[PDB]
Write an enzyme that holds these catalytic residues in place. Structure first.
Site, PDB file in Angstrom:
ATOM      1  N   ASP A 111       0.834  -1.228   0.000  1.00  0.00           N
ATOM      2  CA  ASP A 111       0.000   0.000   0.000  1.00  0.00           C
ATOM      3  C   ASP A 111       0.866   1.274   0.000  1.00  0.00           C
ATOM      4  O   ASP A 111       1.416   1.636   1.043  1.00  0.00           O
ATOM      5  CB  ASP A 111      -0.981  -0.053   1.204  1.00  0.00           C
ATOM      6  CG  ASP A 111      -1.917   1.148   1.226  1.00  0.00           C
ATOM      7  OD1 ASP A 111      -2.071   1.824   0.151  1.00  0.00           O
ATOM      8  OD2 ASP A 111      -2.470   1.423   2.344  1.00  0.00           O
ATOM      9  N   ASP A 165      -1.423   5.817  -5.218  1.00  0.00           N
ATOM     10  CA  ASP A 165      -1.887   4.958  -4.146  1.00  0.00           C
ATOM     11  C   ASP A 165      -2.205   3.526  -4.650  1.00  0.00           C
ATOM     12  O   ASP A 165      -3.307   3.260  -5.178  1.00  0.00           O
ATOM     13  CB  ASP A 165      -3.120   5.678  -3.467  1.00  0.00           C
ATOM     14  CG  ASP A 165      -3.745   4.870  -2.323  1.00  0.00           C
ATOM     15  OD1 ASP A 165      -3.232   3.794  -1.986  1.00  0.00           O
ATOM     16  OD2 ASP A 165      -4.801   5.324  -1.737  1.00  0.00           O
TER      17      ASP A 165
HETATM   18  C1  LIG Z   1     -12.342   3.580  -2.312  1.00  0.00           C
HETATM   19  C2  LIG Z   1     -11.466   2.507  -1.739  1.00  0.00           C
HETATM   20  C3  LIG Z   1     -11.536   1.210  -2.209  1.00  0.00           C
HETATM   21  C4  LIG Z   1     -10.726   0.174  -1.706  1.00  0.00           C
HETATM   22  C5  LIG Z   1      -9.785   0.470  -0.696  1.00  0.00           C
HETATM   23  C6  LIG Z   1      -9.707   1.796  -0.265  1.00  0.00           C
HETATM   24  C7  LIG Z   1     -10.522   2.821  -0.733  1.00  0.00           C
HETATM   25  C8  LIG Z   1      -8.695   2.142   0.777  1.00  0.00           C
HETATM   26  O1  LIG Z   1      -9.055   2.859   1.680  1.00  0.00           O
HETATM   27  N1  LIG Z   1      -7.448   1.671   0.605  1.00  0.00           N
HETATM   28  C9  LIG Z   1      -6.388   1.765   1.626  1.00  0.00           C
HETATM   29  C10 LIG Z   1      -5.402   2.887   1.320  1.00  0.00           C
HETATM   30  O2  LIG Z   1      -4.464   3.016   2.437  1.00  0.00           O
HETATM   31  C11 LIG Z   1      -6.174   4.203   1.256  1.00  0.00           C
HETATM   32  N2  LIG Z   1      -5.267   5.346   0.979  1.00  0.00           N
HETATM   33  C12 LIG Z   1      -5.800   6.704   1.157  1.00  0.00           C
HETATM   34  C13 LIG Z   1      -6.998   6.909   0.224  1.00  0.00           C
HETATM   35  C14 LIG Z   1      -4.633   7.696   0.918  1.00  0.00           C
HETATM   36  C15 LIG Z   1      -6.139   6.820   2.641  1.00  0.00           C
HETATM   37  N3  LIG Z   1      -7.346   6.905   3.249  1.00  0.00           N
HETATM   38  C16 LIG Z   1      -7.105   6.956   4.597  1.00  0.00           C
HETATM   39  C17 LIG Z   1      -5.729   6.960   4.748  1.00  0.00           C
HETATM   40  C18 LIG Z   1      -4.898   6.969   6.060  1.00  0.00           C
HETATM   41  C19 LIG Z   1      -4.245   5.585   6.174  1.00  0.00           C
HETATM   42  C20 LIG Z   1      -3.778   8.027   5.923  1.00  0.00           C
HETATM   43  C21 LIG Z   1      -5.623   7.250   7.423  1.00  0.00           C
HETATM   44  O3  LIG Z   1      -5.104   6.832   3.512  1.00  0.00           O
HETATM   45  C22 LIG Z   1      -5.738   0.382   1.740  1.00  0.00           C
HETATM   46  O4  LIG Z   1      -6.738  -0.606   2.119  1.00  0.00           O
HETATM   47  C23 LIG Z   1      -6.374  -1.975   1.764  1.00  0.00           C
HETATM   48  C24 LIG Z   1      -6.613  -2.192   0.262  1.00  0.00           C
HETATM   49  C25 LIG Z   1      -7.530  -3.024  -0.213  1.00  0.00           C
HETATM   50  C26 LIG Z   1      -7.703  -3.187  -1.720  1.00  0.00           C
HETATM   51  C27 LIG Z   1      -8.584  -2.114  -2.342  1.00  0.00           C
HETATM   52  C28 LIG Z   1     -10.017  -2.407  -1.865  1.00  0.00           C
HETATM   53  C29 LIG Z   1     -10.917  -1.262  -2.231  1.00  0.00           C
HETATM   54  O5  LIG Z   1     -11.895  -1.543  -2.917  1.00  0.00           O
END
Ligand SMILES: Cc1cc2cc(c1)C(=O)N[C@H]([C@H](O)CNC(C)(C)c1ncc(C(C)(C)C)o1)COC/C=C/CCCC2=O
Length: 380
Positions: free
Chosen positions: A36, A223
């Site tokens: 990530d 990302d």
């Molecule tokens: C919209 C969205 C969809 C998805 C994951 C996500 C979103 C999702 O949130 N993915 C995670 C990734 O860390 C998100 N990154 C951003 C958007 C920069 C973020 N938001 C919040 C933060 C902090 C950690 C700084 C608090 O960072 C990783 O999650 C694991 C990944 C799984 C695979 C993707 C699954 C998915 O459908």
């Protein structure tokens, strides 16, 4: 530990992230860990969960050290809570080293683990500024670099590769067998997320014609943990209007454009040629110079594998509205080789050895482009 022995060290399922094999603890416990670039906490399932095949058992590790502190991370999708500690970590198909690193042992979570994803934890590769609980929790990559001679750089080749996907994470350098043509670098604007600046957006070569700060409202990031390209509302609406116009020989329901509903064509007949190319122009390393990365519909129409619908090929529109800035997610990274050149605070893009092409159009990384207007495109 050579770059060739790191080739093909990533697996994934489409829309569910890419993961690398790691070990934690002594003796080593094997876990698959999602890669990530959008977070900075290293965290592993540490208690049973319906969707976890396995989990970190701290009581079996003699090297585990408890830090006596809780931690909570709320992602854009999903969240977890757990307990901090440190332990030894290695990457069997990474560099040949073992380092002591902070680890969050996840004991409760909601909508974070994914049924059938094959991974049990997360490797946040971004900078300490966005680590939880705060920036004193050193991220994994910082520990790796400090504790070893690994150069301060990694690269990601995510392949859209039948639900199974693959790719490579090259730790500590750049493997020339993973790309063709030139690497073009954009500066990292600030070391928190991997923040970059987009200076122009075209859809089949037509400029969206917005003040370029709108593209980076209120940041733009790279990302690998988010699937879609996510665009600030104003940019999102302009992009969807232009893609609808280019594709108007067919009409799709609103739910498709909202990225929620599938569109399906009889197998083998997807009409790629009605959908336009999207060009994202990234700030270059020299004033008012940029380069562009070109995304085909094979990248932004994400196939949804499902035996039940397999008389057809079905896709989700993998572009979504954001209220937290642009997110260049995995569907943008797929088919480019992306170099996270931390040492030189820049990110390099090149066409990947697993690039998208059909007989008419090919994904590209090219430049330079110059712009007359002296406006700074950075928002924040
Ligand atoms: C919209 C969205 C969809 C998805 C994951 C996500 C979103 C999702 O949130 N993915 C995670 C990734 O860390 C998100 N990154 C951003 C958007 C920069 C973020 N938001 C919040 C933060 C902090 C950690 C700084 C608090 O960072 C990783 O999650 C694991 C990944 C799984 C695979 C993707 C699954 C998915 O459908």
């Amino acid at each position: 530990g050579s770059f060739v022995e790191m080739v093909d060290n990533l697996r994934g399922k489409s829309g569910q992230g890419y993961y690398v094999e790691m070990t934690v603890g002594s003796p080593p416990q094997t876990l698959n860990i999602l890669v990530d670039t959008g977070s900075s906490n290293f965290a592993v399932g540490a208690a049973p969960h319906p969707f976890l095949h396995r989990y970190y058992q701290r009581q079996l590790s003699s090297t585990y050290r408890d830090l006596r502190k809780g931690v909570y991370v709320p992602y854009t999708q999903g969240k977890w809570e757990g307990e901090l500690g440190t332990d030894l970590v290695s990457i069997p198909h990474g560099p040949n080293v073992t380092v002591r690193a902070n680890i969050a042992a996840i004991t409760e979570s909601d909508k974070f683990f994914i049924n059938g994803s094959n991974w049990e934890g997360i490797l946040g590769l971004a900078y300490a500024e966005i680590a939880r609980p705060d920036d004193s929790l050193e991220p994994f990559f910082d520990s790796l670099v400090k504790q070893t001679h690994v150069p301060n750089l990694f690269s990601l080749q995510l392949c859209g590769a039948l639900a199974s996907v693959g790719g490579s994470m090259i730790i500590g350098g750049i493997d020339h067998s993973l790309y063709t043509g030139s690497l073009w670098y954009t500066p990292i604007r600030r070391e928190w997320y991997y923040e970059v600046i987009i200076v122009r957006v075209e859809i089949n070569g037509q400029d969206l014609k917005m003040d370029c700060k709108e593209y980076n409202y209120d940041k733009s990031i790279v990302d690998s943990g988010t699937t879609n390209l996510r665009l600030p509302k104003k940019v999102f609406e302009a992009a969807v209007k232009s893609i609808k116009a280019a594709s108007s020989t067919e009409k799709f329901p609103d739910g498709f454009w909202l990225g929620e509903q599938l569109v399906c064509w009889q197998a083998g007949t997807t009409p790629w040629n009605i959908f336009p190319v999207i060009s994202l122009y990234l700030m270059g390393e020299v004033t008012n110079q940029s380069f562009r990365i070109t995304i085909l519909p094979q990248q932004y129409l994400r196939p949804v594998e499902d035996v039940a619908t397999s008389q057809d090929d079905c896709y989700k529109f993998a572009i979504s509205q954001s209220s937290t800035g642009t997110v260049m997610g995995a569907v943008i990274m797929e088919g480019f080789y992306v170099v996270f050149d931390r040492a030189r605070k820049r990110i390099g893009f090149a066409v990947s050895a697993c690039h998208v092409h059909d007989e008419f159009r090919t994904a590209a990384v090219e430049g330079p482009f110059v712009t007359l207007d002296m406006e700074d495109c950075g928002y924040n």
